[PDB]
Assembly symmetry: C4
């Protein structure tokens, strides 16, 4: 595999159509799904030359841990849909690559099993109709050694997935929510979580500048600027189009991550240059899992690592901090 695009072809071959569609699809007309890609394609980097590259490092410190790349595996529900080892395969590969892995509320293997893999994982929370259930998940995650709570705030309910409707998609009997519905979360829910844990709380799905500011005021340790991979509001702006404005508004008050459409080390560089602390990567990790299990995810992460190093050095950046100081131009 020489690009992330090689793996999508491989995953389409192996997966049942309705499962590939559950993975690939977005809401509505898939306008936001396509825009996530279009938005990255319009960004060009202005590289610097003639800088010292004797010790190029792609490492970052985030939420109290060193990570090997400015990247984490996005929360993707029900990974046993894609490979029988599901979340364990992905978590093992992430651990070995030094990349944080986000354990999902809707994981198909229990959060404690995935945490036991090691690698200092994060935990993604959905707010549930029974509040105590959500707060119990938080405490479970913390007890199991998760290092951040990624509170997904853009799912008061699931978006309208027309592929899933047309396919009549449902989970196979062999895939379940192993940690066991959606309730709208509010700012009150955020405070309840913040009071229940000393872990950093990261709000995922922020697109409005004022919501980013309020996240900082609320004590969030980070935000993920995200339209949920085009799966929630169809017509929601891409995160990458809001990122610079949001970075400016928070002015270092929390970590600002982005996701949606990251498909190369060059895309990571673009996100960094627009001010991201790190990115999340979703669909490509699942392509790799479907194509070749743990080894597939390993190969994907090694490829991404090489592409990030390559892009950084070609752009004159010996560190991720330097990459954040790069300028960009829209084309």
């Amino acid at each position: 595999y020489v690009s992330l695009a090689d793996l999508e072809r491989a995953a389409r071959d192996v997966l049942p159509g309705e499962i590939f569609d559950f993975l690939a699809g977005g809401s509505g007309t898939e306008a936001s799904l396509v825009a996530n890609r279009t938005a990255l394609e319009r960004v060009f980097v202005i590289p610097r030359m003639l800088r010292d590259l004797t010790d190029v490092t792609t490492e970052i410190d985030i939420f109290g841990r060193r990570a090997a790349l400015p990247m984490a595996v996005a929360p993707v529900a029900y990974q046993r849909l894609f490979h029988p080892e599901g979340e364990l395969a992905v978590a093992r590969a992430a651990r070995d690559a030094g990349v944080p892995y986000t354990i999902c509320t809707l994981s198909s293997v229990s959060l404690e099993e995935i945490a036991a893999v090691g690698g200092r994982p994060w935990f993604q929370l959905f707010w549930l109709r029974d509040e105590k259930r959500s707060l119990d998940l938080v405490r479970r995650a913390e007890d199991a050694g998760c290092e951040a709570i990624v509170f997904t705030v853009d799912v008061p309910w699931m978006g309208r997935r027309l592929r899933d409707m047309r396919n009549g998609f449902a989970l196979p009997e062999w895939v379940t929510a192993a940690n066991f519905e959606f309730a709208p979360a509010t700012w009150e829910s955020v405070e309840a979580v913040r009071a229940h844990t000393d872990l950093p709380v990261v709000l995922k799905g922020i697109l409005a500048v004022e919501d980013a500011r309020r996240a900082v005021d609320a004590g969030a340790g980070g935000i993920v600027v995200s339209n949920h991979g085009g799966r929630q509001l169809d017509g929601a702006v891409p995160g990458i189009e809001m990122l610079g404005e949001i970075v400016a508004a928070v002015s270092g008050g929390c970590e600002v991550l982005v996701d949606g459409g990251i498909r190369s080390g060059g895309d990571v560089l673009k996100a960094t240059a627009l001010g991201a602390s790190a990115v999340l990567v979703g669909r490509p990790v699942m392509w790799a899992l479907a194509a070749a299990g743990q080894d597939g995810v390993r190969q994907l992460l090694e490829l991404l690592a090489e592409e990030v190093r390559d892009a950084m050095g070609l752009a004159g950046c010996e560190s991720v901090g330097a990459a954040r100081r790069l300028n960009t131009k829209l084309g």
Copy 2:
């Protein structure tokens, strides 16, 4: 049917080609027809998160009536072209859905019959060469219980419909103007109508900011920002491209509706976020009528209602007023 686009395919199957073309077509090269779609596709919504969605309501108050959605059925002439029950089928479905229905001057069933369906309908006026005929229609409409006069101001004569010319299109003998030519309307005509009725007068086909301002000065209760679905001046700007500027200029002095290319609840949200009080929907209602009569229109309206509710909540809006305060970004 899971999207409005499902119904267009269904209508193309059933309708005679020349009738589908009368419905689908625009004037000239259809530049304005296509631009109505392009303009909506370029708008992205910046959703809000973490707001109370315990009682999301899509209702509005407009022209003294509660409506279930920020939407009305656009005036479309000669609905018996599309289904034998024509306007009665559409009016019944609109009534049952709590959506205003606009009875046309060129309706193929008499305005009194359509009004008797109930549902507090509106009446669309064309100015005719014989002025007294136009004012008589106004009084007929008012006597029959119509609640607003939608004065269409963008048809001094019919635009050049090249599909209709190429097809040699003419009304079948079985379709007539049941209320029984065009004269240019002027501001004087508007005043004559305003003096003849206490109903709100709504000027449909306004695109210039100064004309919106003058509409308010003239005592209009509303305007519809509209290029007549691309059927009149070919090269006329889409209403959606003028809407924000017009909303700012009238500064609450009348209701500001928009139409042209609305094809989903997400499109309704975009229009609302740009400042519209409500939208009109034309072609899709006729697709539904052609495909399945009254039940087809019912299904379309239920689908639109669900999509509007979905989009609003995903965008953090518990009310249409909140949706009007959303920001947008061009992509």
Copy 3:
């Protein structure tokens, strides 16, 4: 024929390929040829409503004559290439339609014969290596009753026509320059012409704002803002993209015409709304000539007249002056 595009198809059928290519083609990669169309397609008109249209008139006064439309036939060399009656057929149709016809220096029928048709024609001048020959043409044109000298200033030599090169195109033996090489014209040449005639001198091929200003200072009665239909500098800006800036800079000091890509009455309206006094139309007139001779050109001009009237009225303009006060929006 219901659009100008109908006639292109008809002309392609009848003409020999190399002649159609001489007509259709541009220089280089045809970037400027395509951009002339793209530029018009991006312009949208903001129409006005509710204005008095009791006596819509498309007439203008220009260079001391009333014209039926804000349009003239562009200078196109060697019209016998397209039909045996060549320039006489086109001039007769233009006369009958009340549209000025521009007689070319490279006409395939003598300028005196074409002038004898009537219709108060214009004469297009090329500066020739022998200066006295150019000034003799001016005097011939004036003696024959031409009413303006259209001095083409964008042909110091012919552009690189790759279609003509690839085809090995040459004039048939039966087509000649009946008035009988290129020398670069300069501002000195303009003054020589201005001193030799009391007719208005119109400089055709102006694109720079400073050149438009200088044209006024030089005593020009008009300019044609033009990239020569994409046939001269490949990569030259379309005239329509410079027109508004040029109109502002000359501030009524001369007539400002535009050409390039005008294919409908709506396009005429766009040009007018951007500030043009009138347009020239080239290729479509030749399509009509090729398709059906004099009657073809008559039908084209009647179609254009109807489209101009239609567009003007739909846009709320009872006169061309009103159309010039319309606003536009780029899409």
Copy 4:
């Protein structure tokens, strides 16, 4: 051959696929490769009319030599890949056309042999792991009569060429680096070179404005604003998009060249109008070499010369300096 595009077709026919791909390809997704073309296509020239063109000259003075055109042959490694005479064929044609030829560090014929061809050549330097080797090349180049050192600064290592990876591309045994690895160059390396030679040092691969300024401060005689033909950082801005800003910032302190996507005399004109002193041309010279050896390159250079003269005169420019004063408009 009537355009540069004719020669690409010819080269594709003759070359082995993997060699054509080594030539044509870029890094990553080839975003920067495509953008080099897109960027030029969006630029339109505003030509001037009515200027004296009695003695149009395309000559420039650069780095102490007159050149026949504002153009040089870009450094392209391993020219024996494309034709058996390789660099000697290209250098001979360049000499005869009065165009500078850039001898590569990775030339497949020794720099002394290519210099012996004559034509006052330039020498392109890569910084090598063994510094003394790089400085020895500089002295060799100077001793052999090269007139400028083009220090390529955008290759700390080779970009990721997915075509080459997929093809398993390697040099044939019959092609070698005849002057005999990459080390990142720094500003210190630039100073070492500047101290080692009195020849002008030209830094190739500058895209950031601050790096252009620093180049002047460092004593560079020129820069080449360049993304290395889209072969290095995928997502790097095209040079043509940075050129105007860079020209303004250096404010005559060094020569500013550009490359990437130059495919015609019109493109040369665009670059000049944006402020370039001269351009480099890469791939097209290799197409000509592959298609027809020395004579092919001769024909290409004669074609480019004619296109440059044509474009300049059509734009009203009797000199390259005049062309630099042309204005442009984005379309």
